[PDB]
Amino acid sequence: VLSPADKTNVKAAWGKVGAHAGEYGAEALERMFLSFPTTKTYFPHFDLSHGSAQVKGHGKKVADALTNAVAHVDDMPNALSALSDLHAHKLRVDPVNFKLLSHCLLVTLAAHLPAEFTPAVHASLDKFLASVSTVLTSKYR
């Protein structure tokens, strides 16, 4: 469960991301594809090379979903219900892969927001991304 302090930390850190939201999402995807090549197979219709407009566009989508989760942090199962159906049913994303993308999102935030990425905020962000991942893996059928 996310504590009051966790929610405060996550909202504050994500607030600093700003107009870089889509950019950071795209970078996290790139980090995941390079670090954990098994994840690439979900995107055969994507060119996954650096500077790919498809990865850029997709990063924005991912970021917008995380922003939705932040904005509705006390109601995340409802807010992410459609996305849960998509990832679990249609795409059949292996639950391990959410841990991989979550780690790459943390690395991206650490690399861009050194002042915000305190140990306490790192812990809050990890709990938040684990909560998001729990919702997105909740619909396997």
Partner: protein, 146 residues
């Protein structure tokens, strides 16, 4: 584990800039803060009540220094990690009974600390090289389990 020459280059070049007195303690401290069940193995370290307490704890900084030393040793023997980590494997697996998932977690926390310290210099291809390394170290440390 096999790194390309380009990856070896990226890894060794960055590691030469690492503050070996601090980065290990930062990684171990963050492990204790982010994954609080790991504190089970460090009751003798004293005050771990708050993140500030953990990060400022002299015992956490001192032990982190030895862990980093072990990672440094692994970087020098990337083609023989099993032999390099044999005694540490017996300690962590046979004596301490740490679940090996936590070896992976500490490696990933180290990667976060490197990203924090190096910023844009910690590029996605540099990270990918370091992920091969910390996976190799985790697997070698877990050898006594398998």
């Amino acid at each position: 584990v096999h790194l390309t020459p380009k990856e070896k280059s990226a890894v060794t070049a960055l590691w030469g800039k690492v503050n070996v007195d601090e980065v290990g303690g930062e990684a171990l401290g963050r492990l204790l803060v982010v994954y609080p069940w790991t504190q089970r193995f460090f009751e003798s370290f004293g005050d771990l009540s708050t993140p500030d307490a953990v990060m400022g704890n002299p015992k956490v900084k001192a032990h982190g220094k030895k862990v980093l030393g072990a990672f440094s040793d692994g970087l020098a023997h990337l083609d023989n990690l099993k032999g390099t980590f044999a005694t540490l494997s017996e300690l962590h697996c046979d004596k301490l009974h740490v679940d090996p998932e936590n070896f992976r977690l500490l490696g990933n926390v180290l990667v976060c600390v490197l990203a924090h310290h190096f910023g844009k210099e910690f590029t996605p291809p540099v990270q990918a090289a370091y992920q091969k390394v910390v996976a190799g170290v985790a697997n070698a440390l877990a050898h006594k389990y398998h």
